[PDB]
Structure 1
Amino acid sequence: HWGYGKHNGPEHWHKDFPIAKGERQSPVDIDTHTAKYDPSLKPLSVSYDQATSLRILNNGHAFNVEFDDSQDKAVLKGGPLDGTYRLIQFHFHWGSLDGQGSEHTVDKKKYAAELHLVHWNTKYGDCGKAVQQPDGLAVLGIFLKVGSAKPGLQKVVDVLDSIKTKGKSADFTNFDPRGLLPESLDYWTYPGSLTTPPLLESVTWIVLKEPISVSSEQVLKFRKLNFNGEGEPEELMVDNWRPAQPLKNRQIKASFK
Protein backbone atom coordinates (compact mmCIF):
# COMPACT_ATOMS: atom_id res chain seq x y z
CA HIS A 1 0.00 0.00 0.00
CA TRP A 2 1.00 3.70 -0.11
CA GLY A 3 3.94 5.17 1.81
CA TYR A 4 7.07 7.24 1.41
CA GLY A 5 9.55 4.68 0.04
CA LYS A 6 11.02 4.32 -3.46
CA HIS A 7 8.36 1.83 -4.54
CA ASN A 8 5.25 3.25 -2.78
CA GLY A 9 6.06 6.97 -2.38
CA PRO A 10 4.52 10.23 -3.68
CA GLU A 11 5.45 9.53 -7.33
CA HIS A 12 3.36 6.31 -7.22
CA TRP A 13 0.24 7.66 -5.45
CA HIS A 14 -1.53 8.77 -8.64
CA LYS A 15 -2.14 5.15 -9.74
CA ASP A 16 -4.48 4.40 -6.81
CA PHE A 17 -5.45 8.07 -6.26
CA PRO A 18 -5.73 9.86 -9.65
CA ILE A 19 -6.64 13.13 -7.87
CA ALA A 20 -2.86 13.24 -7.04
CA LYS A 21 -2.51 15.09 -10.38
CA GLY A 22 -5.51 17.35 -9.70
CA GLU A 23 -6.06 21.09 -9.85
CA ARG A 24 -5.74 21.97 -6.15
CA GLN A 25 -3.14 19.63 -4.67
CA SER A 26 -1.03 20.27 -1.56
CA PRO A 27 1.54 21.08 -0.41
CA VAL A 28 2.86 23.97 -2.50
CA ASP A 29 5.82 26.31 -2.49
CA ILE A 30 4.83 29.68 -1.03
CA ASP A 31 6.52 32.34 -3.12
CA THR A 32 6.51 35.21 -0.63
CA HIS A 33 7.01 37.94 -3.22
CA THR A 34 4.06 36.73 -5.38
CA ALA A 35 1.63 36.18 -2.45
CA LYS A 36 -0.69 39.20 -2.12
CA TYR A 37 -2.01 40.88 1.02
CA ASP A 38 -5.79 40.38 1.14
CA PRO A 39 -7.83 43.04 3.00
CA SER A 40 -11.02 40.89 2.77
CA LEU A 41 -9.50 38.39 5.27
CA LYS A 42 -11.11 38.72 8.72
CA PRO A 43 -9.09 38.27 11.95
CA LEU A 44 -8.03 34.62 12.60
CA SER A 45 -9.35 33.11 15.84
CA VAL A 46 -7.69 30.08 17.44
CA SER A 47 -9.83 29.08 20.43
CA TYR A 48 -8.22 26.07 22.12
CA ASP A 49 -9.07 26.85 25.81
CA GLN A 50 -11.48 23.90 26.21
CA ALA A 51 -9.48 21.45 24.04
CA THR A 52 -9.84 17.85 25.23
CA SER A 53 -7.08 15.56 23.98
CA LEU A 54 -7.80 11.82 24.19
CA ARG A 55 -5.15 9.63 22.68
CA ILE A 56 -1.99 9.44 20.59
CA LEU A 57 -1.73 6.90 17.73
CA ASN A 58 1.05 5.69 15.43
CA ASN A 59 -0.86 5.06 12.18
CA GLY A 60 2.16 3.89 10.15
CA HIS A 61 2.51 7.25 8.33
CA ALA A 62 2.84 9.70 11.24
CA PHE A 63 1.46 9.97 14.79
CA ASN A 64 -1.87 11.64 15.56
CA VAL A 65 -2.87 13.34 18.78
CA GLU A 66 -6.65 12.96 18.75
CA PHE A 67 -9.26 15.23 20.34
CA ASP A 68 -12.84 14.98 21.51
CA ASP A 69 -14.69 16.77 18.68
CA SER A 70 -18.25 15.91 19.86
CA GLN A 71 -18.75 19.53 21.03
CA ASP A 72 -17.44 23.03 20.20
CA LYS A 73 -14.37 22.75 22.49
CA ALA A 74 -11.34 23.62 20.33
CA VAL A 75 -12.22 25.65 17.25
CA LEU A 76 -10.70 27.66 14.43
CA LYS A 77 -12.65 30.61 12.99
CA GLY A 78 -12.09 33.81 11.03
CA GLY A 79 -9.36 34.48 8.49
CA PRO A 80 -10.45 32.97 5.16
CA LEU A 81 -13.01 30.72 6.89
CA ASP A 82 -16.78 30.92 6.98
CA GLY A 83 -18.34 29.42 10.12
CA THR A 84 -16.70 27.19 12.71
CA TYR A 85 -14.09 24.46 12.25
CA ARG A 86 -13.50 21.93 15.04
CA LEU A 87 -10.09 20.51 15.95
CA ILE A 88 -10.03 16.72 15.48
CA GLN A 89 -6.30 15.87 15.48
CA PHE A 90 -2.79 17.11 14.99
CA HIS A 91 0.27 15.43 13.56
CA PHE A 92 3.65 16.25 12.06
CA HIS A 93 5.74 15.56 8.97
CA TRP A 94 9.52 15.50 9.41
CA GLY A 95 12.81 14.60 7.81
CA SER A 96 15.80 12.32 8.27
CA LEU A 97 17.95 15.49 8.48
CA ASP A 98 17.30 19.00 9.84
CA GLY A 99 17.42 20.42 6.27
CA GLN A 100 14.21 18.73 5.13
CA GLY A 101 10.89 17.55 6.48
CA SER A 102 8.30 20.23 5.83
CA GLU A 103 5.63 19.78 3.18
CA HIS A 104 5.06 23.42 2.40
CA THR A 105 8.15 25.39 1.48
CA VAL A 106 8.78 29.15 1.66
CA ASP A 107 10.71 30.53 -1.32
CA LYS A 108 11.84 26.90 -1.75
CA LYS A 109 13.14 26.69 1.87
CA LYS A 110 12.37 23.38 3.58
CA TYR A 111 11.95 23.37 7.35
CA ALA A 112 12.88 20.47 9.64
CA ALA A 113 9.24 19.56 10.21
CA GLU A 114 5.67 20.79 9.83
CA LEU A 115 2.80 20.58 12.31
CA HIS A 116 -0.75 20.12 10.94
CA LEU A 117 -3.69 20.96 13.20
CA VAL A 118 -6.67 19.47 11.39
CA HIS A 119 -10.14 21.00 11.73
CA TRP A 120 -13.51 20.19 10.11
CA ASN A 121 -16.38 22.48 9.16
CA THR A 122 -19.25 21.93 11.60
CA LYS A 123 -21.80 22.62 8.83
CA TYR A 124 -21.10 19.02 7.68
CA GLY A 125 -21.73 17.28 11.01
CA ASP A 126 -18.68 15.00 11.11
CA CYS A 127 -15.19 14.91 9.69
CA GLY A 128 -15.86 11.98 7.29
CA LYS A 129 -18.59 14.01 5.62
CA ALA A 130 -16.61 17.27 5.75
CA VAL A 131 -13.56 15.80 3.99
CA GLN A 132 -15.71 15.18 0.87
CA GLN A 133 -16.59 18.90 0.53
CA PRO A 134 -14.59 21.70 -1.14
CA ASP A 135 -14.78 23.78 2.10
CA GLY A 136 -14.77 20.82 4.49
CA LEU A 137 -11.43 21.08 6.30
CA ALA A 138 -9.09 23.76 7.55
CA VAL A 139 -5.54 22.74 8.32
CA LEU A 140 -3.39 25.11 10.33
CA GLY A 141 0.19 24.48 9.31
CA ILE A 142 3.14 25.50 11.48
CA PHE A 143 6.79 25.15 10.50
CA LEU A 144 9.37 23.70 12.92
CA LYS A 145 13.01 24.79 12.91
CA VAL A 146 15.76 23.27 15.05
CA GLY A 147 17.03 25.59 17.79
CA SER A 148 15.74 26.08 21.34
CA ALA A 149 13.41 23.41 22.77
CA LYS A 150 9.64 23.93 22.62
CA PRO A 151 8.45 23.27 26.21
CA GLY A 152 4.88 22.57 25.05
CA LEU A 153 6.09 19.78 22.74
CA GLN A 154 7.93 17.77 25.40
CA LYS A 155 4.85 15.85 26.65
CA VAL A 156 4.35 14.60 23.06
CA VAL A 157 8.06 13.70 22.75
CA ASP A 158 8.06 11.71 26.00
CA VAL A 159 5.12 9.46 25.03
CA LEU A 160 6.61 8.41 21.64
CA ASP A 161 8.52 5.47 23.21
CA SER A 162 5.11 3.93 24.01
CA ILE A 163 3.86 4.14 20.38
CA LYS A 164 7.01 3.11 18.51
CA THR A 165 5.30 0.92 15.92
CA LYS A 166 2.30 1.04 13.58
CA GLY A 167 -1.06 0.49 15.29
CA LYS A 168 0.13 1.32 18.82
CA SER A 169 -1.82 3.94 20.79
CA ALA A 170 -1.61 5.47 24.27
CA ASP A 171 -3.73 7.64 26.56
CA PHE A 172 -2.97 11.29 25.96
CA THR A 173 -5.38 13.36 28.01
CA ASN A 174 -4.96 16.94 29.23
CA PHE A 175 -2.56 18.03 26.48
CA ASP A 176 -2.84 21.74 25.66
CA PRO A 177 -2.24 22.45 21.94
CA ARG A 178 -1.83 26.20 22.69
CA GLY A 179 1.72 25.30 23.74
CA LEU A 180 2.61 24.48 20.10
CA LEU A 181 1.72 27.90 18.63
CA PRO A 182 4.17 30.71 17.76
CA GLU A 183 3.62 34.30 18.96
CA SER A 184 2.29 35.63 15.66
CA LEU A 185 -0.77 34.40 13.77
CA ASP A 186 0.36 36.07 10.49
CA TYR A 187 -0.42 33.53 7.75
CA TRP A 188 -0.66 32.58 4.09
CA THR A 189 -3.79 30.85 2.80
CA TYR A 190 -4.82 28.96 -0.32
CA PRO A 191 -7.26 26.22 -1.36
CA GLY A 192 -5.67 22.77 -1.41
CA SER A 193 -5.86 19.12 -0.50
CA LEU A 194 -4.95 16.45 1.96
CA THR A 195 -1.20 15.83 1.55
CA THR A 196 -1.63 12.06 1.97
CA PRO A 197 -3.96 9.62 0.26
CA PRO A 198 -6.85 9.97 -0.35
CA LEU A 199 -5.55 13.46 -1.37
CA LEU A 200 -9.07 14.92 -1.31
CA GLU A 201 -9.39 18.53 -2.45
CA SER A 202 -11.26 19.67 0.63
CA VAL A 203 -8.76 21.78 2.59
CA THR A 204 -8.42 25.49 3.22
CA TRP A 205 -4.74 25.76 4.11
CA ILE A 206 -3.67 28.34 6.67
CA VAL A 207 0.12 28.32 6.98
CA LEU A 208 1.70 30.49 9.69
CA LYS A 209 4.66 32.66 8.72
CA GLU A 210 6.42 32.34 12.09
CA PRO A 211 8.02 28.94 12.74
CA ILE A 212 8.29 27.39 16.18
CA SER A 213 11.70 26.31 17.43
CA VAL A 214 12.19 22.75 18.70
CA SER A 215 15.44 21.19 19.94
CA SER A 216 17.59 18.70 18.04
CA GLU A 217 16.83 16.25 20.87
CA GLN A 218 13.06 16.68 20.37
CA VAL A 219 13.19 16.04 16.60
CA LEU A 220 15.63 13.12 17.06
CA LYS A 221 12.90 11.43 19.12
CA PHE A 222 10.41 11.81 16.21
CA ARG A 223 13.00 9.98 14.07
CA LYS A 224 13.06 6.95 16.43
CA LEU A 225 9.48 6.05 15.49
CA ASN A 226 8.81 3.16 13.10
CA PHE A 227 6.66 2.95 9.94
CA ASN A 228 6.46 -0.83 10.56
CA GLY A 229 4.37 -2.82 13.04
CA GLU A 230 5.77 -4.64 16.08
CA GLY A 231 7.93 -7.66 15.22
CA GLU A 232 8.53 -6.49 11.63
CA PRO A 233 11.85 -5.28 10.12
CA GLU A 234 12.63 -1.78 11.45
CA GLU A 235 11.99 1.07 9.00
CA LEU A 236 12.50 4.42 10.73
CA MET A 237 9.61 6.86 10.40
CA VAL A 238 11.50 9.68 8.65
CA ASP A 239 10.88 11.74 5.51
CA ASN A 240 7.11 11.30 5.74
CA TRP A 241 6.49 14.45 3.67
CA ARG A 242 5.02 15.00 0.23
CA PRO A 243 7.00 17.45 -1.93
CA ALA A 244 5.55 20.68 -3.32
CA GLN A 245 2.90 20.25 -6.02
CA PRO A 246 2.02 22.49 -8.99
CA LEU A 247 0.22 25.68 -7.95
CA LYS A 248 -1.85 25.69 -11.17
CA ASN A 249 -4.76 28.19 -11.14
CA ARG A 250 -4.33 29.36 -7.53
CA GLN A 251 -3.34 32.56 -5.74
CA ILE A 252 -1.76 32.44 -2.29
CA LYS A 253 -3.10 35.24 -0.09
CA ALA A 254 -1.22 36.84 2.83
CA SER A 255 -2.86 38.13 6.02
CA PHE A 256 -0.08 40.69 6.55
CA LYS A 257 1.71 43.51 4.71
Structure 2
Amino acid sequence: EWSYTNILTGPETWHEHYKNMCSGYYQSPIDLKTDISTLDLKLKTVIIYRNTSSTETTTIQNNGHSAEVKFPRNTWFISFDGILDYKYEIIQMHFHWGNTDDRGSEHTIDGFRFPLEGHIVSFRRQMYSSPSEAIGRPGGLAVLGIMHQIVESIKYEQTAFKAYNNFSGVLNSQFVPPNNSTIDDINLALLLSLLNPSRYFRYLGSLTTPPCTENVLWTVFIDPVLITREQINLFRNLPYGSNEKQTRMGDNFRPIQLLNPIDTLASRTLYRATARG
Protein backbone atom coordinates (compact mmCIF):
# COMPACT_ATOMS: atom_id res chain seq x y z
CA GLU A 1 0.00 0.00 0.00
CA TRP A 2 1.70 3.12 -1.24
CA SER A 3 0.33 5.96 -3.35
CA TYR A 4 1.05 9.57 -4.48
CA THR A 5 -2.38 11.16 -3.71
CA ASN A 6 -4.00 9.09 -0.86
CA ILE A 7 -2.87 10.88 2.38
CA LEU A 8 -3.09 7.43 4.17
CA THR A 9 -0.32 5.85 1.94
CA GLY A 10 1.17 9.01 0.30
CA PRO A 11 4.84 10.13 0.12
CA GLU A 12 4.75 11.71 3.67
CA THR A 13 4.07 8.22 5.13
CA TRP A 14 6.80 6.30 3.23
CA HIS A 15 9.49 7.01 5.92
CA GLU A 16 7.13 5.34 8.50
CA HIS A 17 5.77 2.49 6.22
CA TYR A 18 9.14 1.62 4.53
CA LYS A 19 11.86 2.62 7.02
CA ASN A 20 14.35 0.39 5.00
CA MET A 21 15.16 2.61 3.18
CA CYS A 22 12.68 5.59 2.75
CA SER A 23 13.89 6.86 6.23
CA GLY A 24 17.52 7.05 4.98
CA TYR A 25 19.68 10.12 4.31
CA TYR A 26 20.88 9.19 0.75
CA GLN A 27 17.36 9.75 -0.75
CA SER A 28 16.19 10.92 -4.21
CA PRO A 29 15.06 13.12 -5.76
CA ILE A 30 17.07 16.19 -4.82
CA ASP A 31 17.30 19.79 -5.98
CA LEU A 32 20.19 19.80 -8.50
CA LYS A 33 21.95 23.06 -7.56
CA THR A 34 24.48 24.14 -10.24
CA ASP A 35 26.22 26.58 -7.77
CA ILE A 36 26.76 24.04 -4.93
CA SER A 37 27.77 21.09 -7.22
CA THR A 38 31.40 20.06 -7.97
CA LEU A 39 32.49 19.96 -11.65
CA ASP A 40 34.24 16.59 -12.27
CA LEU A 41 36.02 16.75 -15.66
CA LYS A 42 36.67 12.94 -15.58
CA LEU A 43 32.91 12.14 -15.98
CA LYS A 44 32.54 11.22 -19.66
CA THR A 45 29.78 11.35 -22.27
CA VAL A 46 26.96 8.84 -21.72
CA ILE A 47 26.34 6.38 -24.59
CA ILE A 48 23.24 4.24 -24.97
CA TYR A 49 23.59 1.35 -27.47
CA ARG A 50 21.61 -1.69 -28.61
CA ASN A 51 22.46 -5.37 -29.22
CA THR A 52 21.81 -5.54 -33.06
CA SER A 53 20.78 -9.23 -32.88
CA SER A 54 18.15 -8.76 -30.11
CA THR A 55 14.69 -9.75 -31.46
CA GLU A 56 12.32 -9.73 -28.43
CA THR A 57 9.31 -7.35 -28.12
CA THR A 58 9.09 -4.30 -25.74
CA THR A 59 5.91 -3.72 -23.65
CA ILE A 60 4.42 -0.80 -21.70
CA GLN A 61 2.32 -1.17 -18.54
CA ASN A 62 0.00 1.11 -16.56
CA ASN A 63 1.34 -0.16 -13.19
CA GLY A 64 -1.17 2.14 -11.31
CA HIS A 65 1.55 4.72 -10.32
CA SER A 66 3.29 5.39 -13.69
CA ALA A 67 3.58 4.34 -17.36
CA GLU A 68 6.50 1.83 -17.42
CA VAL A 69 8.22 0.60 -20.60
CA LYS A 70 9.65 -2.95 -19.95
CA PHE A 71 12.63 -3.71 -22.27
CA PRO A 72 13.62 -7.28 -23.08
CA ARG A 73 16.85 -8.63 -21.47
CA ASN A 74 20.25 -8.23 -23.20
CA THR A 75 19.13 -5.52 -25.66
CA TRP A 76 19.69 -1.90 -24.40
CA PHE A 77 22.92 -0.79 -22.58
CA ILE A 78 24.59 2.28 -21.07
CA SER A 79 28.32 3.05 -21.21
CA PHE A 80 29.78 5.69 -18.90
CA ASP A 81 33.41 4.89 -19.95
CA GLY A 82 33.30 4.85 -23.81
CA ILE A 83 33.62 1.00 -23.87
CA LEU A 84 30.64 -0.93 -25.37
CA ASP A 85 31.11 -4.02 -23.02
CA TYR A 86 27.59 -4.30 -21.44
CA LYS A 87 28.49 -2.95 -17.95
CA TYR A 88 24.95 -1.47 -17.51
CA GLU A 89 21.82 -3.15 -18.94
CA ILE A 90 18.58 -1.20 -19.35
CA ILE A 91 15.50 -2.87 -17.76
CA GLN A 92 12.76 -0.25 -17.93
CA MET A 93 11.82 3.37 -18.54
CA HIS A 94 9.04 5.13 -16.67
CA PHE A 95 7.58 8.61 -16.43
CA HIS A 96 6.60 11.19 -13.82
CA TRP A 97 4.36 14.15 -14.76
CA GLY A 98 2.04 16.83 -13.34
CA ASN A 99 -1.70 17.62 -13.43
CA THR A 100 -0.45 20.96 -14.94
CA ASP A 101 2.52 21.97 -17.20
CA ASP A 102 4.42 23.83 -14.41
CA ARG A 103 5.18 20.59 -12.43
CA GLY A 104 5.77 16.85 -12.89
CA SER A 105 9.53 16.17 -12.59
CA GLU A 106 11.02 14.44 -9.50
CA HIS A 107 14.35 16.28 -9.69
CA THR A 108 14.44 20.07 -9.89
CA ILE A 109 17.26 22.09 -11.45
CA ASP A 110 17.93 25.21 -9.33
CA GLY A 111 14.34 24.82 -8.01
CA PHE A 112 12.74 24.55 -11.51
CA ARG A 113 10.23 21.72 -12.17
CA PHE A 114 9.80 20.27 -15.68
CA PRO A 115 6.46 18.91 -16.86
CA LEU A 116 7.76 15.33 -17.45
CA GLU A 117 10.85 13.37 -16.19
CA GLY A 118 11.71 10.00 -17.74
CA HIS A 119 13.77 7.45 -15.77
CA ILE A 120 15.84 4.91 -17.76
CA VAL A 121 16.59 2.16 -15.18
CA SER A 122 19.66 -0.10 -15.66
CA PHE A 123 21.43 -2.68 -13.50
CA ARG A 124 25.16 -3.03 -13.09
CA ARG A 125 25.63 -6.14 -15.25
CA GLN A 126 29.46 -5.75 -14.73
CA MET A 127 28.80 -7.17 -11.16
CA TYR A 128 25.26 -8.67 -11.09
CA SER A 129 23.99 -11.30 -13.61
CA SER A 130 20.27 -10.40 -13.25
CA PRO A 131 18.07 -7.40 -12.45
CA SER A 132 16.38 -9.30 -9.53
CA GLU A 133 19.94 -9.91 -8.07
CA ALA A 134 20.88 -6.17 -8.64
CA ILE A 135 17.67 -4.32 -7.56
CA GLY A 136 18.14 -5.06 -3.85
CA ARG A 137 21.98 -5.07 -3.66
CA PRO A 138 24.61 -2.35 -3.01
CA GLY A 139 25.62 -0.40 -6.14
CA GLY A 140 23.04 -2.44 -8.19
CA LEU A 141 21.34 0.29 -10.28
CA ALA A 142 22.09 3.31 -12.50
CA VAL A 143 19.20 5.56 -13.56
CA LEU A 144 19.27 8.30 -16.22
CA GLY A 145 16.93 11.24 -15.70
CA ILE A 146 15.61 12.85 -18.87
CA MET A 147 13.85 16.22 -18.48
CA HIS A 148 11.14 17.11 -21.08
CA GLN A 149 9.97 20.65 -21.85
CA ILE A 150 6.85 21.79 -23.81
CA VAL A 151 7.24 23.83 -27.05
CA GLU A 152 4.41 25.22 -29.26
CA SER A 153 6.33 24.92 -32.59
CA ILE A 154 8.09 21.64 -33.53
CA LYS A 155 7.95 18.78 -36.12
CA TYR A 156 6.77 15.44 -34.60
CA GLU A 157 10.11 13.90 -35.79
CA GLN A 158 12.18 16.31 -33.51
CA THR A 159 10.10 15.50 -30.35
CA ALA A 160 10.95 12.86 -27.75
CA PHE A 161 7.73 11.06 -28.90
CA LYS A 162 9.48 10.18 -32.21
CA ALA A 163 12.10 8.27 -30.17
CA TYR A 164 9.20 6.62 -28.23
CA ASN A 165 7.42 5.83 -31.64
CA ASN A 166 4.42 7.54 -29.98
CA PHE A 167 4.22 4.49 -27.57
CA SER A 168 2.51 2.85 -30.67
CA GLY A 169 -0.65 4.90 -29.84
CA VAL A 170 -1.29 2.76 -26.72
CA LEU A 171 -1.79 5.71 -24.26
CA ASN A 172 -5.60 6.26 -23.69
CA SER A 173 -8.29 6.27 -20.88
CA GLN A 174 -8.84 2.48 -21.31
CA PHE A 175 -5.13 1.68 -20.70
CA VAL A 176 -6.01 0.62 -17.13
CA PRO A 177 -3.80 -0.88 -14.39
CA PRO A 178 -2.30 -3.46 -14.42
CA ASN A 179 -2.67 -3.88 -18.24
CA ASN A 180 0.44 -4.20 -20.44
CA SER A 181 0.57 -3.83 -24.26
CA THR A 182 3.35 -4.73 -26.73
CA ILE A 183 4.72 -1.59 -28.52
CA ASP A 184 7.24 -0.75 -31.27
CA ASP A 185 10.76 -0.56 -29.72
CA ILE A 186 11.91 2.79 -28.21
CA ASN A 187 14.92 4.29 -30.05
CA LEU A 188 16.84 5.23 -26.85
CA ALA A 189 19.91 6.29 -28.93
CA LEU A 190 17.75 8.83 -30.80
CA LEU A 191 16.28 10.03 -27.43
CA LEU A 192 19.78 10.72 -26.06
CA SER A 193 20.80 12.52 -29.33
CA LEU A 194 17.95 15.06 -28.58
CA LEU A 195 19.97 16.49 -25.61
CA ASN A 196 23.68 16.97 -24.73
CA PRO A 197 24.80 13.63 -23.25
CA SER A 198 28.04 15.23 -21.82
CA ARG A 199 26.16 17.71 -19.59
CA TYR A 200 24.61 16.19 -16.47
CA PHE A 201 24.39 16.01 -12.68
CA ARG A 202 25.76 12.90 -10.96
CA TYR A 203 25.23 11.67 -7.35
CA LEU A 204 24.57 8.55 -5.29
CA GLY A 205 20.95 8.24 -4.23
CA SER A 206 17.87 6.10 -4.14
CA LEU A 207 14.82 4.76 -5.90
CA THR A 208 12.09 7.45 -5.76
CA THR A 209 9.32 4.90 -4.95
CA PRO A 210 9.18 2.53 -1.94
CA PRO A 211 11.35 0.88 -0.72
CA CYS A 212 13.57 3.87 -1.81
CA THR A 213 16.64 1.59 -1.91
CA GLU A 214 19.93 3.62 -1.56
CA ASN A 215 21.72 1.74 -4.43
CA VAL A 216 21.20 4.17 -7.38
CA LEU A 217 23.97 5.85 -9.37
CA TRP A 218 22.00 8.95 -10.62
CA THR A 219 22.69 10.83 -13.91
CA VAL A 220 20.25 13.70 -14.66
CA PHE A 221 20.82 15.51 -18.01
CA ILE A 222 20.67 19.28 -17.69
CA ASP A 223 19.27 19.97 -21.23
CA PRO A 224 15.61 18.93 -21.77
CA VAL A 225 14.21 16.99 -24.76
CA LEU A 226 11.14 18.69 -26.36
CA ILE A 227 7.48 17.61 -26.43
CA THR A 228 4.15 19.27 -27.31
CA ARG A 229 1.16 20.01 -25.02
CA GLU A 230 -0.78 17.31 -26.98
CA GLN A 231 1.93 14.72 -26.11
CA ILE A 232 1.94 15.53 -22.30
CA ASN A 233 -1.93 15.26 -22.35
CA LEU A 234 -1.56 11.66 -23.67
CA PHE A 235 -0.02 10.66 -20.26
CA ARG A 236 -2.76 12.58 -18.31
CA ASN A 237 -5.53 10.39 -19.88
CA LEU A 238 -4.13 7.35 -17.99
CA PRO A 239 -6.16 6.36 -14.89
CA TYR A 240 -4.50 5.96 -11.44
CA GLY A 241 -4.78 2.57 -9.59
CA SER A 242 -7.67 2.33 -7.00
CA ASN A 243 -5.36 2.89 -3.96
CA GLU A 244 -5.06 6.52 -5.27
CA LYS A 245 -7.51 9.34 -4.37
CA GLN A 246 -7.10 11.22 -7.75
CA THR A 247 -8.77 9.47 -10.77
CA ARG A 248 -6.46 10.61 -13.62
CA MET A 249 -2.72 9.75 -13.29
CA GLY A 250 -0.77 12.94 -12.56
CA ASP A 251 1.43 14.46 -9.84
CA ASN A 252 3.13 10.98 -9.68
CA PHE A 253 6.39 12.44 -8.25
CA ARG A 254 8.06 12.23 -4.83
CA PRO A 255 8.75 15.43 -2.87
CA ILE A 256 12.31 16.86 -2.92
CA GLN A 257 14.78 15.24 -0.41
CA LEU A 258 17.88 17.02 1.05
CA LEU A 259 21.33 16.08 -0.26
CA ASN A 260 22.52 15.82 3.41
CA PRO A 261 19.79 15.56 6.04
CA ILE A 262 21.00 16.39 9.57
CA ASP A 263 21.45 12.70 10.66
CA THR A 264 23.85 11.80 7.80
CA LEU A 265 27.01 9.93 9.01
CA ALA A 266 28.94 10.60 5.72
CA SER A 267 27.94 13.56 3.52
CA ARG A 268 27.38 13.05 -0.20
CA THR A 269 28.51 15.45 -2.88
CA LEU A 270 26.54 16.46 -5.99
CA TYR A 271 28.84 16.36 -9.07
CA ARG A 272 28.35 17.77 -12.54
CA ALA A 273 29.83 16.91 -15.88
CA THR A 274 30.46 18.94 -19.07
CA ALA A 275 32.13 18.27 -22.44
CA ARG A 276 35.89 18.16 -23.10
CA GLY A 277 35.71 21.91 -24.18
So what's the TM-score if we normalise by structure 2?
0.84
TM-aligned CA deviation for residue 153 of structure 1: 3.6
In structure 1, how many angstroms separate the alpha carbons of the residues matched to 2:232 and 2:41? 37
- Any gaps of 5 or more consecutive residues in structure 2? 261-266
Question: Which residue, out of 157, 173, 176, partners 2:187?
Answer: 176
CA 1:126–1:49: 2 relative to 1, 3 Å: closer
Q: 1:125 to 1:246 in 2, by over 3 A?
A: same
CA separation of 1:200/1:163 partners in 2, compared to 1, >3 Å: closer, same or farther? farther
Which of 225, 237, 243 is equivalent to 2:249? 237
Query: Residue 4 of structure 2 aligns to a residue in which SS?
Result: coil
Residue in structure 2 matched with residue 65 of structure 1 by the alignment: 69
Aligned to 1:192: 205
Identity %: 34
Using the TM superposition, give the Cα deviation of residue 97 of structure 1 relative to its aligned residue in structure 2, in angstroms. Answer: 0.5
Cα drift, residue 80 of structure 1? 11
Residues 209-244 of structure 1, C-alpha deviation per residue, up to 9 Å, x if partnerless? 110111000001100101136xx9971100000011
Name the CA distance, whole Å, in 1 between partners of 2:222 and 2:78.
17
The residue matched to 2:171 in structure 1 has which SS?
helix
Cα root mean square deviation, aligned: 2.4
**Aligned twin of 1:100:** 103
Match of 2:104, SS?
A: coil
**Matched residue count:** 253
> Of the candidates 236, 239, 250, which is equivalent to residue 268 of structure 2?
250
Whole-angstrom CA distance in 2 between matches of 1:227 and 1:80: 40
What residue number does 2:263 align with? none
**Cα distance in 1 between the residues matched to 2:89 and 2:274:** 25
CA distance in 2, matches of 1:203, 1:11: 21
> Cα 1:42–1:152, aligned 2, differ >3 Å: closer, same or farther?
closer
Q: Please name the residue that 1:38 is paired with.
A: 40
Q: With the length of structure 1 as denominator, give the TM-score of the two structures.
A: 0.90
Shift in Å at residue 145 of structure 1? 0.9
In the alignment, structure 1 residue 120 sits paired with structure 2 residue 123: yes
Q: Tell me if the contact between 2:173 and 2:238 (Cα under 8 Å) persists in the aligned partners.
A: no
Aligned amino acid, residue 188 of structure 1: F
Distance, in Å, in 2 between the alignment partners of 1:158 and 1:141 is 23
What amino acid is the match of 1:137? L
Aligned partner of residue 11 in structure 2, secondary structure: coil
Note if contact 1:56-1:65 (Cα within 8 Å) is conserved in structure 2.
yes
Deviation at 1:125, TM superposition (A): 1.1
- Can you list the C-alpha shifts for 1:44-91, whole angstroms capped at 9, x where unaligned? 22213647552111111101111111x2x2111225999711011101
Q: Unaligned 5+ residue runs, structure 1?
A: none
What is the aligned counterpart of 2:226 among 210, 213, 227? 213
* Runs of 4+ displaced beyond 4 Å: 79-83
